[PDB]
Amino acid sequence: RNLSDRAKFESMINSPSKSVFVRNLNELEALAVRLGKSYRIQLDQAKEKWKVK
């Protein structure tokens, strides 16, 4: 099924490298907002996971 933004999130959050994280982060943050606010927290968790400060 299309419109599976949750799948994109779970796919991106799977194993993102440093530079890979940033290049995915832009769309990742967009997807997080699209999904809601609870998943946005998980996004922020991934940001802090690496650093993103």
Helix content: over 70%
What would the CATH topology be? Methane Monooxygenase Hydroxylase, Chain G, domain 1
Q: How many distinct folded domains?
A: 1
Tell me the number of helical segments per DSSP (H or I, 4 or more residues long): 3
CATH architecture: Up-down Bundle
CATH superfamily name? Answer: Hypothetical membrane protein ta0354_69_121
Spell out the helices and strands N to C. HHH
**What is the CATH level 1 assignment?**
Mainly Alpha
Strand content: under 5%
Question: Which structural class fits the helix and strand makeup?
Answer: mainly alpha
The count of strands amounts to 0
Return Rg in Å. Answer: 10 Å
Oligomer: monomer
What spatial form do the alpha-carbon principal axes imply? globular
Q: Major sheet: size, sense and barrel closure?
A: none
N→C terminal distance: 35 Å
